[PDB]
């Protein structure tokens, strides 16, 4: 029997679910059974990015005819997909491109996550405890009546955007996070330390809790990244929550809060995929949203600023304008994961 707190057992059982990783890949037309992750080569994955680059080139230039169809055939050649019967579809928009780009990263990530959940040959220990141990990340459940849970719930509820009205969120449980090595590596020296959201797909959490949040790999096409290749956070809960991709069938998602050492922000009104180059001494990029929590409402939690809402207009306006801030850092050493929220999404049927 498991020696873990019951709340941790449920958390672990949820994120370590292998089926759920298979099903997420299958949704992106990758069959892990027909094509085991273990057989992908480094060079195969590199060739796949190479073809996604040719696809991106076509798309950015509005070329949807023959050059695009060949680039897509070359992509499907290099990366095995499973379409059931149908004609492999053309990769035509930014959303479909970007799904492919994320797919490629998840192939290596899911492969390592599935190795992580392997229990030892001999061991009497409950598998939950082995899974938990293998993450190398302490997850400490907090009581609902505690001050910290109340503050986090306010931050969750107060910063749910008024324009994300398709669901509410309930906080089911809150875990304080202590990832091995992160405290020692953290840029404790940098000013402007903020506690910020990061939402992600259920199958990504094994990789995040065992590796921390990572920048995208060198070979991925840069021009999909609106502010460069770093780690992205929101100060609005529902904006990160949108990246959980919860659904009615699986209405449970996770949100991560991290202390992020922002230092001096390079504040940018408009997207720039070359944003990291623009730093010249600064430490992060802030993409300037129209709406935002105001510093008058801010509290602190362990010396990070917690930007409580509600959001209000910031007088930023433009071309394109960001709805809400987002923050980017370019080294994991500016991040220290701190709370993980287990969240019930309640979807609404509105018209």
Ligand X SMILES: NC(=O)c1cc(F)cc2c1C(=O)N(C1CCN(C3CCC(F)(F)CC3)CC1)C2
214 among the known binding-site residues?
A: yes
Stretch near ligand X under the rule CB under 6 A, chosen from 28-36, 175-183, 194-202, 260-268: 194-202
End-to-end CA distance of the chain: 49
The answer to the question of residue 108 lying near ligand X (CB under 6 A) is no
Nearest distance from C-beta of residue 102 to ligand X, angstroms: 5
Q: Per the residue annotation, which of 56, 111, 182, 326 is the catalytic one?
A: 326
199 among the known binding-site residues?
A: yes
The answer to the question of residue 258 lying near ligand X (CB under 6 A) is no
Q: CA-CA distances (angstroms) from residue 254 to 8, 36, 202, 316?
A: 13, 27, 7, 31
CA–CA gap between residue 340 and residue 324 (Å, rounded): 22
3 state SS of 105: helix
The answer to the question of residue 155 lying near ligand X (CB under 6 A) is no
Describe the crossing of helices 127-135 and 6-15 by its angle, rounded to 10 degrees.
80
240 among the known binding-site residues?
A: yes
Q: Which residues contact 330 (CB under 8 A, 6 or more apart)?
A: 215, 228, 229, 230, 231, 276, 279, 284
Tell me how many degrees the CA angle 325-328-334 measures, rounded to the nearest 5: 130
Mask: binding to ligand X, 283-322, rule CB under 6 A, as x and -? ----------------------------------------
CB nearer ligand X, residue 117 or residue 216 = 216
Stretch near ligand X under the rule CB under 6 A, chosen from 13-21, 43-51, 176-184, 217-225: 217-225
Q: Which residues contact 236 (CB under 8 A, 6 or more apart)?
A: 159, 160, 161, 197, 292, 293, 309, 311, 324, 325
Residue nearest to ligand X (CB): 224
Q: Which residues contact 296 (CB under 8 A, 6 or more apart)?
A: none
Within 75-104, the residues that bind ligand X by CB under 6 A are 98, 101-102
Phi, psi of 327 (to 5 degrees): -125, 145
Decide if 326 is catalytic. Answer: yes
Stretch near ligand X under the rule CB under 6 A, chosen from 41-49, 218-226, 265-273, 293-301: 218-226
Phi, psi of 61 (to 5 degrees): -105, 15
The answer to the question of residue 243 lying near ligand X (CB under 6 A) is yes
Phi, psi of 182 (to 5 degrees): -70, -40
Nearest distance from C-beta of residue 120 to ligand X, angstroms: 33
- Whether 220 contacts 49, CB under 8 Å: yes
Within 222-241, the residues that bind ligand X by CB under 6 A are 224-225, 232-234, 239-240
Nearest distance from C-beta of residue 33 to ligand X, angstroms: 26
CB nearer ligand X, residue 182 or residue 326 = 326
- Whether 141 contacts 5, CB under 8 Å: yes
The answer to the question of residue 330 lying near ligand X (CB under 6 A) is no
What are the binding residues?
198-200, 207, 214, 240
User: Which residues carry out catalysis?
Assistant: 326
Point out which residues bind ligand X (CB under 6 A). Answer: 98, 101-102, 197-200, 221, 224-225, 232-234, 239-240, 243, 326
């Amino acid at each position: 029997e498991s020696q873990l707190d019951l709340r941790v057992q449920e958390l672990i059982k949820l994120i370590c679910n292998v089926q759920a990783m298979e099903e997420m890949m299958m949704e992106m037309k990758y069959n892990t059974k027909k094509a085991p992750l273990g057989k992908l080569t480094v060079a195969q994955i590199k060739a796949g990015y190479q073809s996604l680059k040719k696809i991106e080139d076509c798309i950015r230039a509005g070329q949807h005819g023959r050059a695009l169809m060949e680039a897509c055939n070359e992509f499907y050649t290099r990366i095995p997909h499973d379409f059931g019967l149908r004609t492999p579809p053309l990769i035509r928009t930014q959303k479909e491109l970007s799904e492919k780009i994320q797919l490629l990263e998840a192939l290596g990530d899911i492969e390592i996550a599935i190795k992580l959940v392997k229990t030892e040959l001999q061991s009497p220990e409950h598998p939950l405890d082995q899974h938990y141990r293998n993450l190398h990340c302490a997850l400490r459940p907090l009581d609902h009546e505690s001050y910290e849970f109340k503050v986090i719930s306010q931050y969750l509820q107060s910063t749910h955007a008024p324009t994300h009205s398709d669901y509410t969120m309930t906080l089911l449980d809150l875990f304080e996070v202590e990832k091995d090595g992160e405290k020692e590596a953290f840029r404790e020296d940098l000013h402007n330390r903020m506690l910020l959201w990061h939402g992600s797909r259920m199958s990504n959490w094994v990789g995040i809790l065992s590796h921390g949040l990572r920048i995208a790999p060198p070979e991925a096409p840069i021009t999909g990244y609106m502010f460069g290749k770093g780690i992205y956070f929101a100060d609005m809960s529902s904006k990160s929550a949108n990246y959980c991709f919860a659904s009615r069938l699986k209405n449970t998602g996770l949100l991560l809060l991290s202390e992020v050492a922002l230092g001096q922000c390079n504040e940018l009104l408009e997207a720039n995929p070359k944003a990291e180059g623009l730093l010249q001494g600064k430490h992060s990029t802030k993409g300037l949203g129209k709406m935002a929590p105001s510093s008058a409402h801010f509290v602190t939690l362990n010396g990070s600023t917690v930007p409580l809402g509600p959001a209000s207009d910031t007088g930023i306006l433009n071309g394109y304008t960001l709805n809400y801030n987002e923050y980017i850092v370019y080294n994991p050493n500016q991040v220290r994961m701190r709370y993980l929220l287990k969240v019930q999404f309640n979807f609404l049927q509105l018209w």
